[PDB]
Amino acid sequence: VDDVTGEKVREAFEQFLEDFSVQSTDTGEVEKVYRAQIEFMKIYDLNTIYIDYQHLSMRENGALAMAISEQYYRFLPFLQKGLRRVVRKYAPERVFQISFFNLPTVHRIRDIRSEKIGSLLSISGTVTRTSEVRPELYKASFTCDMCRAIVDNVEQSFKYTEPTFCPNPSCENRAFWTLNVTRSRFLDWQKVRIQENANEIPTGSMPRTLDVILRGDSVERAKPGDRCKFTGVEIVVPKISFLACHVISIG
């Protein structure tokens, strides 16, 4: 039911990114700064943009933000495809990272339920331990058993996957394709430990900790032992982990 809703929300997100330019001279009227942000990153090509949720909450009387807010993992490739189409039309080795920040509500680690699985969340606390960065497979280049044909396979952040059918009808087998690392983009993957703050611990309870995953260029910014606030998506790991996209040194 979201196959025709994804293109509509992709059109709505690209209309939000297309209809807002910069008219911020003399502190007059306000309009969003995204096109100049893309024009500034055109030289550096990092593509690790920051989109404010408070600036996104004014369109469709907040209803566009509430529909994206619960189906974020189901609408994320449509959002990155709309971002790719607007930077393909406004500008001429391609990785993308869309980060959301400044949520109006700060949630603790003890109020996490299973009703927010796949939705976005703001988690604040203190970092206990850190894991050295390692390459994330993301997408790989599989070669066939007889075709020797390249296939660009997209992982789903769960475990080492494998295709099913060869696209070229020269073969229809299901035996073991071989992995290839040349044509497979890799993103640094870090796993840190977040824990409950000392001022919001219940009486007699234990400060329950949890592991949060992080990719893109949000890694190597979080300093150990500092109060931190993350914004990301609740992703299950075969355990309920987290994926963050925004880092800040609060406190």
Partner: protein, 367 residues
């Protein structure tokens, strides 16, 4: 480390070694000579120490400052040359090493097209030797100014980065006890069909580098490439161009009319600079904006000499149509490539040849 070792008790009749010596200079061009009769005259190098009384004027000791007396010893019967110091013990070692030099000349310059012209020190006695006495950073790379030079030394070996012997572009050094080292000049490298090399020298433990050269004539007929330029004038220009000259008019005139030909240390920058910017073109899809702080140690590690903005300013002065001098908003100099492709080696070879031709036209019009 592989230096040829021969004996001297059986080559005294001169009938068994010429072919082997000719064969051995095809790969190894630094010869070692041992076990002579100079075991009591070689340690008598303490006589000529503190004279210090006459000016230079291209003859005798260029006494430059208590640390160096470079005796450019001129010959006796040639015109414009007259030099006589005391040097008794040095006359005895000059006689023995000059007989040793003529011995090696008769056994090794017979395998070339002319075996009577290159030894013309037997008749006219044409010798201008380098007695560099370093008595109580250093000098430039010194090749032998003659065509054959045998010298007593301590280590006497180094290697500048180029395409020569021990081609690994690093300074190599071996140590040798109680022997003599032979090295030939650059005129014998043009006389023999490409079988020689060069060797840099510095302050050795036996600091008195007594370089006794063969020093070819004033009117020796060199072939087609050097018929107009004689051995005497060209090598005298090299002799007066390497150390500092402040005594008289003419070598200072040769220094101000010859030391502005130093484009080979900056135009060679043009043989490597585009390579690295192109290496930045095949790796940074950032539109290649460069930073001076990241391009400076790259070329400073690629080239051991000092590289600062004077070379960039000289390259901007000689060729401004291929680069930009446009500054950014932060306040630093930026420079890019005007080609629409990444790089083409034929166009790069044509651009390097055009840069060489433009610098040669600048050298012609600057004098």
């Amino acid at each position: 480390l592989r230096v040829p070792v021969i004996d001297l008790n059986r080559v005294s009749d001169e009938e068994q070694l010429l072919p082997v010596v000719r064969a051995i200079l095809l790969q190894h061009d630094t010869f070692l000579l041992k076990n002579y009769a100079n075991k009591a005259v070689l340690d008598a190098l303490l006589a000529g120490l503190t004279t210090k009384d006459l000016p230079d004027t291209s003859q005798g000791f260029d006494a430059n400052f208590v640390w160096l007396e470079q005796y450019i010893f001129d010959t006796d019967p040639q015109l414009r040359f007259d030099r006589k110091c005391r040097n008794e013990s040095l006359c005895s070692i000059y006689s023995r090493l000059f007989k040793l030099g003529l011995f090696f000349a008769q056994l090794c310059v017979k395998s070339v097209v002319s075996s009577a012209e290159l030894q013309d020190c037997i008749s006219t006695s044409h010798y201008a030797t380098k007695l560099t006495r370093y008595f109580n950073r250093d000098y430039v790379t010194f090749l032998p100014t003659g065509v054959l030079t045998i010298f007593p030394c301590a280590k006497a070996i180094r290697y500048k980065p180029s395409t020569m012997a021990t081609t690994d572009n690093s300074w190599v050094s071996i140590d040798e006890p109680d022997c003599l080292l032979f090295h030939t000049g650059t005129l014998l490298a043009r006389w023999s069909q490409g079988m020689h090399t060069t060797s840099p020298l510095q302050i050795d433990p036996r600091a008195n580098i007594v370089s006794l050269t063969i020093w070819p004539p004033l009117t020796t007929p060199i072939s087609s490439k050097g018929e107009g330029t004689i051995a005497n004038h060209l090598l005298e220009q090299q002799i007066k161009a390497f150390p500092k000259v402040a005594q008289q008019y003419y070598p200072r005139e040769l220094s101000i009319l010859r030391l502005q030909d130093a484009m080979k240390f900056v135009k060679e920058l043009f043989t490597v600079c585009e390579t690295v910017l192109s290496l930045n073109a095949l790796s940074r899809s950032t539109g290649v904006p460069p930073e001076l702080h990241v391009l400076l140690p790259q070329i400073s590690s690629m080239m051991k000499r000092k590289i600062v903005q004077d070379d960039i300013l000289k390259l901007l002065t000689i060729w401004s149509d291929a680069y930009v001098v446009e500054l950014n908003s932060r306040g630093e100099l930026t420079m890019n490539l005007p080609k629409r492709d990444n790089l083409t080696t034929l166009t790069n070879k044509s651009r390097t040849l055009a840069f060489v031709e433009r610098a040669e036209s600048w050298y012609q019009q600057v004098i």
